[PDB]
Design a protein around this ligand. Structure first.
Ligand SMILES: C=C(C)CCOP(=O)(O)OP(=O)(O)O
Ligand SMILES: C=C(C)CCOP(=O)(O)OP(=O)(O)O
Ligand SMILES: C=C(C)CCOP(=O)(O)OP(=O)(O)O
Ligand SMILES: C=C(C)CCOP(=O)(O)OP(=O)(O)O
Ligand SMILES: [Mg+2]
Ligand SMILES: [Mg+2]
Lengths: 231, 231
């Protein structure tokens, strides 16, 4: 018996899936065509992570600041999310993947929140790769949710202000039950982390590639892992 | 009359001054020799920032996790900090630079805390470049200090848990009165931000160079600014 053990201890990879709009515009197409093509890269990246023994893969699909995008571009994205979930959930379940969405799902329409809740419940018992989709997520928002939780406990007389330290807040941010983020990959050419997992990437390796998200493939993923192994 | 206006709106640069140990080891010297040489790069980087109209320059000099280094290597660093302050404060004052140390200065010896307090008081009225030296600083520690401040206010019945949002916490993290960080440069070849300004770099451009901190010069700084202007 022998499992796949990712290069030099890599446990949790997070990817900022950027470059979809640019990939479509370069071909004279609308942005939504690039995001749809980006759904194929998600499937491939998830397959690669699960098949290589990565414990957790966290994908930045929609930020807390992207509501400022064109309205109809946003609605198309919500419908794509629903479609992507329907296209993949059964497969996720079969492959022992545990799905979690991180971010403020209250702002989503009913049909979408319903699909999210169902997909997580169905795979809640799975023990392989944990796949986290960050949708309507911000690193600062994440930290603030944890802070409010500690502030509720202070009011209730259940915690003194001077007892709050890093480990306590760390237990209230998203993904605190998972391995810390080891490697962040950002496709698309920009060199910013854009409010992604601020608290959790304190010590992560950061890897930027000019490859655009819809073109990102297994060889590109192996490439980031090798930079990690050597880095 | 005409001021220097840094490329495309750059207001605040933060630098992770890494590669000092490696720079010394490559020449067969002890790490402390590399940090001393690194003090010359600080002087040059401060001169470049002030002369080019940068509003704030924030330098990572000692992290909240570096106490785990060799004891005597740590004591040598504290003495270097004292010496560097004595060598530069008068000059800082003459050049209209406002000095601030960010980090937990309680852990420092008396002589050092005294020099820090004096240097800040002397330049507190200055209006040119604000130079922030992050010493015994961690991004997570920074956030936690702000959280404790909001938790003290909740206890006092001065704030409800549900009133805490991003802007409120933002007003309690280090450097909240300054422009947000526009560009982070890390010398030395590693691609990590290492618990530096987590909250504040949410949207900063990140620039990594293999140049080691003691070799970092004005042309290297112009190079990062140009990547920023084009990036
Ligand atoms: O983010 P998106 O992938 O939607 O678009 P761009 O990074 O190409 O700007
Ligand atoms: C790829 C995702 C989901 C988010 C980050 O890209 P953004 O375009 O939202 O933010 P910036 O590039 O403007 O930094
Ligand atoms: O941090 P330091 O500059 O002290 O040493 P290295 O980055 O070279 O490891
Ligand atoms: C250059 C400074 C002051 C801090 C960051 O370097 P560290 O060596 O402390 O942390 P890692 O490289 O281990 O990520
Ligand atoms: Mg963008
Ligand atoms: Mg190091």
């Amino acid at each position: 018996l022998s499992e796949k053990l990712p290069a030099h201890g890599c446990r949790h990879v997070a990817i900022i899936m950027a470059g979809n709009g640019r990939w479509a515009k370069k071909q004279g197409k609308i942005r939504a065509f690039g995001h749809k093509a980006g759904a194929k890269s998600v499937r491939r990246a998830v397959s690669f992570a699960a098949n290589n023994g990565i414990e957790a893969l966290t994908l930045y699909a929609f930020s807390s600041e992207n509501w400022n995008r064109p309205a109809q571009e946003v609605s198309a994205l919500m419908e794509l999310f629903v479609w992507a979930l329907d296209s993949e959930v059964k497969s996720l379940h079969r492959h022992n993947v545990r799905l979690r969405i991180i971010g403020d799902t209250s702002r989503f329409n009913s049909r979408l929140q319903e699909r999210i809740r169902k997909s997580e419940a169905l795979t809640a018992g799975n023990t392989g790769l944990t796949l986290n989709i960050a949708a309507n997520y911000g690193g600062r928002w994440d930290i603030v949710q944890g802070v409010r939780q500690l502030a509720e406990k202070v009011q209730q007389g259940n915690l003194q202000p001077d007892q709050i330290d890093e480990e306590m807040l760390n237990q209230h941010v998203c993904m605190h039950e998972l391995a810390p983020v080891d490697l962040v990959i950002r496709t698309g050419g920009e060199h910013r982390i854009s409010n992604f997992l601020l608290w959790q990437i304190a010590y992560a390796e950061l890897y930027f590639t000019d490859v655009l998200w819809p073109d990102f493939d297994e060889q590109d993923f192996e490439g980031a892992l090798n930079a990690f192994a050597n880095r």
